[PDB]
């Protein structure tokens, strides 16, 4: 699918893509390979869809948080630099692109949100979120506003949500302990909604609108990354880059990104991508090219980071980096952000309350692990005759009642529909691991191509139980957890919005409740 003798690169449109294309041109110089840089809308969403069919770009650039998802789905080549090259980048930048002990990308640069302020409007920027309503009242009398930043991407609101005890996954990383709807997070997002309610911010404010307002000198402050600094430089606003305000005395905790370059597993040009990234981009000359288009932040390349470390804007970036936490790269990061995006937009717009909205985000962020636990437990106890002794952990009442419900309703389906199950199981030839990976592909297709309701969800999980019974029978128990993950995966990928609407597994318990 991907053309050979070429490199197609995706990078996000807020980055220095003209600069990366200049590195592209210098690679063409030496090698006669053309390099196309593109910056599609929603490339973090489009990359996994197209790569899954052996398509998309050779190289994708994104923050490291998405790359584990991509790696889990087998969409990235293992990268294998020598020690000599590894030692040119900071050990911690490598750690951000390590998934199941394999390097899955080249780290490029460390990114944290800072408070950006207009020195001519605000000589001393505020130290606390609490003083911003006063400062806004004061600035409005002079025809200005205190603060405008992008309220459409949860990334920009995360530092306030994290400040007083909000977290995605507790720290390796425990995917059973999600802190999206705890007191700390409610307080953070409540402060934001109050700012909006009291007219100190507008729910509809996005990246464009905030950027234009700061750069015309209408607002005294914005929250943004190093990529933003080029446009402000050009607007001749006298700006400073500082530490974010505290909330309830606690520092703002930004989620730190490492801009990372992955190589599509479907690429016929992997050697070229490695050569480009290792010997063209990740050089003093290579990164300088890009950094002049749009600043990268604290670059991963020690040699060039020593140069830029002297910049007080980088020093403030690093200061904000250390008050915050480096993002997880676990596959569930994608579901976490989709849930928290939706919570922030609906709290901001008043379509839900803070409590309603963060509850729905807690369900969304937990949904995959909650679903896997129930489904894999049902499959294993169906196959073996014996229930799993281990405790269900957090939200363990929901898992226990869902499993107990599924036992009654799933046994009923398997009993009544045994004919078609034996029939469909015989029509397929389950004999080995490779046959199991095939069966997954079919279920995904059959489930996906039909209406959403609890009966069809029980039927998918009940057929899985049926198949798990058989897999045990042919000494193939090892393939039962992969089968559970496949059923879990399609269920929460394709029916996420419906499951959150039904209050997830509590709705399942309620719907089939005697
Ligand atoms: C299990 C199944 C599904 C089927 C899946 C399947 C097929 C093959 C693989 F790998 O997954 S995944 C899946 N996920 C959800 N629903 C499925 O099937 C149902 C319909 C259905 C289906 C079967 C049993 C109970 C069934 O009852 C569904 C039911 C019970 C209560 N409410 N509902 C909607 C739905 O999609 O609505 C299915 C789909 C079709 C099926 O049979 C069609 C007839 N066929 C004739 C030839 N013979 C040799 C084999 C059987 C069967 Cl047996
Ligand atoms: O809004 C959630 C979003 O946050 C991060 O994306 C950042 C990115 O890291 C930055 O490089 C810059 O481009 O801004 C983006 C936010 O608009 C996560 O990396 C991303 O996965 C997530 O969707
Ligand atoms: Cl409101």
UniProtKB/Swiss-Prot annotation:
Matching CDD domains: PBP2_MBP
General function of this protein: Part of the ABC transporter complex MalEFGK involved in maltose/maltodextrin import. Binds maltose and higher maltodextrins.
Pfam families, A to Z: SBP_bac_1
Subunit structure: The complex is composed of two ATP-binding proteins (MalK), two transmembrane proteins (MalG and MalF) and a solute-binding protein (MalE).
The protein's name in its UniProt record: Maltose/maltodextrin-binding periplasmic protein
Gene: malE
Subcellular location: Periplasm
GO biological process, one term: maltodextrin transmembrane transport
């Amino acid at each position: 699918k991907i053309e050979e003798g070429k490199l197609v690169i995706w990078i996000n449109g807020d980055k220095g893509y003209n600069g990366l294309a200049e590195v592209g041109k210098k690679f063409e110089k030496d090698t006669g390979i053309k390099v196309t840089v593109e910056h599609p809308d929603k490339l973090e969403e489009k990359f996994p869809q197209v790569a899954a069919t052996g398509d998309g770009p050779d190289i994708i650039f994104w923050a490291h948080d998405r790359f584990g998802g991509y790696a889990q789905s087998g969409l990235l080549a293992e990268i294998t630099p020598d020690k000599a090259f590894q030692d040119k980048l900071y050990p911690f930048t490598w750690d951000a692109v390590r998934y199941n002990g394999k390097l899955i990308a080249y780290p490029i640069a460390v990114e944290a949100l800072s408070l950006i302020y207009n020195k001519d409007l605000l000589p001393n920027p505020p130290k606390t979120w609490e003083e911003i309503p006063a400062l806004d009242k004061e600035l409005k009398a002079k025809g200005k506003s205190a603060l405008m930043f992008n309220l459409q991407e949860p990334y920009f609101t995360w530092p306030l949500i994290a400040a007083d005890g909000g977290y995605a996954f507790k720290y390796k990383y425990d995917i059973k302990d999600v802190g999206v709807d705890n007191a700390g997070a409610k307080a953070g997002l409540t402060f934001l909604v109050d700012l909006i309610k009291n007219k100190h911010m507008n729910a509809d404010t996005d990246y464009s609108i905030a950027e234009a307002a700061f750069n015309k000198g209408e607002t005294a402050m914005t929250i943004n990354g190093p990529w933003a600094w080029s446009n402000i430089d050009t607007s001749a606003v006298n700006y400073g880059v500082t530490v974010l305000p505290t909330f309830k005395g606690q520092p703002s905790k930004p989620f730190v990104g490492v801009l990372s370059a992955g190589i599509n597993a479907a690429s016929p040009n992997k050697e070229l991508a490695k050569e480009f990234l290792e010997n063209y981009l990740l050089t003093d000359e290579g990164l300088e090219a890009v950094n002049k288009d749009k600043p990268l932040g604290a670059v991963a390349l020690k040699s060039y980071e020593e140069e830029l470390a002297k910049d007080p804007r980088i020093a403030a970036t690093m200061e904000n980096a250390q008050k915050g936490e480096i993002m997880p790269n676990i596959p569930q990061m994608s579901a976490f952000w989709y849930a928290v995006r939706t919570a922030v937009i609906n709290a901001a717009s008043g379509r839900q309350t803070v409590d309603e909205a963060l509850k729905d985000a807690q369900t969304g962020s937990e949904l995959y692990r909650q679903s896997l636990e129930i489904i894999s437990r049902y499959l294993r106890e169906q196959a073996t005759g014996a229930a799993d002794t281990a405790p269900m952990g957090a939200s363990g009442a929901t898992s226990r009642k869902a499993l107990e419900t599924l036992r009654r309703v799933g046994d009923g389906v398997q009993r009544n529909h045994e004919t078609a199950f034996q029939g469909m199981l015989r029509k397929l030839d389950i004999k080995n691991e490779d046959d199991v990976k095939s069966l997954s592909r079919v279920m995904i297709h059959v489930f996906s191509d039909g209406v959403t309701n609890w009966g069809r969800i029980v039927t998918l999980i009940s057929f899985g139980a049926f198949v798990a019974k058989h897999l045990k029978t042919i000494n193939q128990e090892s393939c039962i957890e992969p089968l559970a993950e496949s059923i879990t995966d399609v269920l929460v990928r394709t029916k996420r919005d419906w499951l959150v609407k039904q209050r997830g597994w509590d709705g399942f318990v309620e719907f089939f409740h005697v």
